UniProtKB/Swiss-Prot annotation, chains A, B:
Its cofactor is Zn(2+). The keyword Transmembrane helix does not apply. GO terms for molecular function: all-trans-retinol dehydrogenase (NAD+) activity; zinc ion binding. This is Alcohol dehydrogenase E chain. The modification N-acetylserine is found at S1. PANTHER family: ALCOHOL DEHYDROGENASE (PTHR43880), ALCOHOL DEHYDROGENASE 1A (PTHR43880:SF1). GO terms for cellular component: cytosol. An alcohol binds at S48, H67. It comes from Equus caballus. NAD(+) binds at S48, G199, L200, G201, G202, V203, G204, D223, K228, V292, G293, V294, F319, R369. Its EC number is 1.1.1.1.
């Protein structure tokens, strides 16, 4: 009944850096050509949403953030062919156009239509579907899931299994897939290897799950919050280390523990110093280090290139290297077939209107993923 | 007739940084257990030897430098099994002990017995076989080929074909194998790809040869010395670019020429700034950049890790990634079957006694490889 009409609903608007989210009455325009309007069912709180608040990640304000979500298609614009009203969907913060050089490459996933590299905070057409008191509100990563309803470009949504539990599979929209893919697809962890994972939040726990799936023999978790260690061990870490416990740098500790360096390391925090530490702790001749965490805007790291000359490989990726529209439905099917677990990532469930409590939980160190429900 | 005896012979001794080599009489001890004494036939002048003179590359002085060479075994110490007197050999600046975790790894080649990481300038046993003016003189990379005779550990020498032309195949001891392998083994250049090669000296020309062998569609040579371009095109470059000809930074120029970034880039100079430029010019989602050049001692580069987070891979390697003792004889056999060419690398030939003129030819830009004959 709402098709082709403006919807008035609630959304969490970020008006200013370093402020709480403000629950506002917003107007959500109907979808234009090749757009899809989605009724939200569940959305996770990811550290990257917090990075918008903290100024770590720069995107145009005011904004409706949120990017890790699942919902049901309310309506489709002209020319949409990949979803229909009533379909369960996951919005894709990294699109898959299918036509750019990256989409056509076997390995590449950072589609050229992304809004990550040079954020505009709009739909593909350069406009917004959201107003608050007549003021346009920016989109975030072409998703904007902290709203009862959102509009996304067709290249930024995937149809998923009709029977999937949206309150769990929302994590496939970001954290789970990112960490898991970073292990299994980007690093290509090998059986019997030794892995070190820096950061034991939702993404890092998903890296651990991927290293375990890949058959790693040792998975060393590293975090300054020792409260994170029990869950890390539950999902496959063989050992955990707190850098604060040592009188020496942790790269030296990990090199000694691993008898000369790890096979694979992962930076899953977003600090420059830990990126260099994680590179250094992999074995100098054949080690691989993958950057997953997102650091503060515009800051360069300093490193000695001899770390690379000896033979190390250093790489990064977005969304675990997964081609998003192809991969999301397959990951949901794998979940439904019991190939991996999502419940270990979910520590809190709150109604949407308690969004700020959810962020307070993340910032305090107490949660992994809070799922917001509608 | 010299077996078991100290040999008095000529060598090029480097007493101090930023001074000419001194050709003078040295004493060369006989080989101890598991060591091999070699009569030099030919040695190339590699930019790395110049780096030792300049202080870019730190190694203990005084020293007998030289590491790209071929010769004939004069005598063997007790226990040597892999070469015999009269065998043609190439000394290996990267050893292959066969026993350490790196040697056992399928992809590693930076054997833990190397003298590169923390140079001592000795034999494996921590002593020197060279005396000059009554003083011990350091070895260089376990090779020291700027001498009529040298002594090397058995793990630092490979037996080659008895019919090998030593005045050509000395380049398999460093520059050819390094560049070729950086393309074919480390980057794994693919058929139909676009490559950019920064630096068109002997190593960069060898990278081009490897890219061409791998079936690259486009190979863009980059050098500030346009006199290098003609030879780069002869060996496979499809285009050459001089950064000094352009108002834009060369990474922008290359990204444009390649319709969004190259598949593979190679830094084959030894400058921090070109390492970051080369990384930048590869395609942000799936590009690979390999560091080959050696930059000034102890200096760090500065870079933005967003360059990696989008999907780039950055790596480096010593000796083209080749496991040295296994690979060198096979490369020589391939050269004898005319699978690649060395003559394009050899621009000048001089007697050993004219070593300082050879270094002048390199420093002035005029040469690729000068081969010194004994
Ligand atoms: N590359 C990509 O596609 C994606 C990247 N991200 C990024 O991944 C990172 C992790 O995200 P979440 O797991 O949601 O975050 P999180 O905040 O839940 O987890 C980070 C962990 O790092 C630990 N930590 C913080 N400082 C540390 C230090 N100095 N040393 C050791 N441990 C430290 C924390 O205690 C925490 O447990 C964030 O930077 C986020 O923006 C997240 C998803 C997608
Ligand atoms: N990784 C390894 O195992 C090995 C590394 N090396 C290193 O590889 C590098 C190259 O060695 P060679 O080919 O013998 O040296 P080379 O000096 O003959 O060639 C370097 C080229 O770079 C060009 N160049 C200088 N500054 C430039 C700039 N700003 N932009 C563009 N081009 C520039 C020069 O004009 C020259 O043609 C050296 O740093 C050497 O130490 C060499 C062999 C082994
Ligand atoms: C402004 C770009 C931010 C992208 C953040 C991260 C890669 N995505 C999801 O957490
Ligand atoms: C003291 C370490 C120098 C290594 C130099 C380079 C990798 N080898 C030959 O050119
Ligand atoms: Zn695309
Ligand atoms: Zn996220
Ligand atoms: Zn060399
Ligand atoms: Zn070894």
């Amino acid at each position: 009944s709402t098709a082709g009409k403006v919807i008035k609903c609630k959304a969490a608007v970020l008006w200013e850096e370093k402020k709480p989210f403000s629950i506002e009455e917003v107007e959500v325009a109907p979808p234009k050509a090749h757009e899809v309007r989605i009724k939200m069912v569940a959305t996770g709180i990811c550290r990257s949403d917090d990075h918008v608040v903290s100024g770590t990640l720069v995107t145009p304000l005011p904004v409706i953030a949120g990017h890790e979500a699942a919902g049901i298609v309310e309506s489709i614009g002209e020319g949409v062919t990949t979803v229909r009203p009533g379909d369960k969907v996951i919005p894709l913060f990294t699109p898959q156009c299918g036509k750019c050089r990256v989409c056509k490459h076997p390995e590449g996933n950072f589609c050229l239509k992304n809004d990550l590299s040079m954020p505009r905070g709009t739909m593909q057409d350069g406009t917004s579907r959201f107003t608050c008191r007549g003021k346009p509100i920016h989109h975030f990563l072409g998703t904007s899931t902290f709203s009862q309803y959102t509009v996304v470009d067709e290249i930024s949504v995937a149809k998923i299994d009709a029977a999937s539990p949206l309150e769990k599979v929302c994590l496939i929209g970001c954290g789970f897939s990112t960490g898991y893919g970073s292990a299994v697809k980007v690093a290509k962890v090998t059986q019997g290897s030794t892995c070190a994972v820096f950061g034991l939040g939702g993404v890092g726990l998903s890296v651990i799950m991927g290293c375990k799936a890949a058959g790693a023999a040792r998975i060393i978790g590293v975090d300054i919050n020792k409260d994170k260690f029990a869950k890390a061990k539950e999902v496959g870490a063989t050992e955990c280390v707190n850098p604060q416990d040592y009188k020496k740098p942790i790269q030296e500790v990990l090199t000694e523990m691993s008898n000369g360096g790890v096979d694979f390391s992962f930076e899953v925090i977003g600090r420059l110093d830990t990126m260099v530490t994680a590179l250094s702790c992999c074995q100098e001749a054949y080690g691989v280090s993958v950057i997953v965490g997102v650091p503060p805007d515009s800051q360069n790291l300093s490193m000695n290139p001899m770390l690379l000359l000896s033979g190390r490989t250093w790489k990064g990726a977005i969304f675990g290297g997964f081609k998003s529209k192809d991969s999301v439905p397959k990951l949901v099917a794998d979940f439904m077939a019991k190939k991996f677990a999502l419940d270990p990532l979910i520590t809190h469930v709150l109604p949407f209107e308690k969004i700020n409590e959810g962020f307070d939980l993340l910032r305090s160190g107490e949660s992994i993923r809070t799922i917001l429900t509608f």
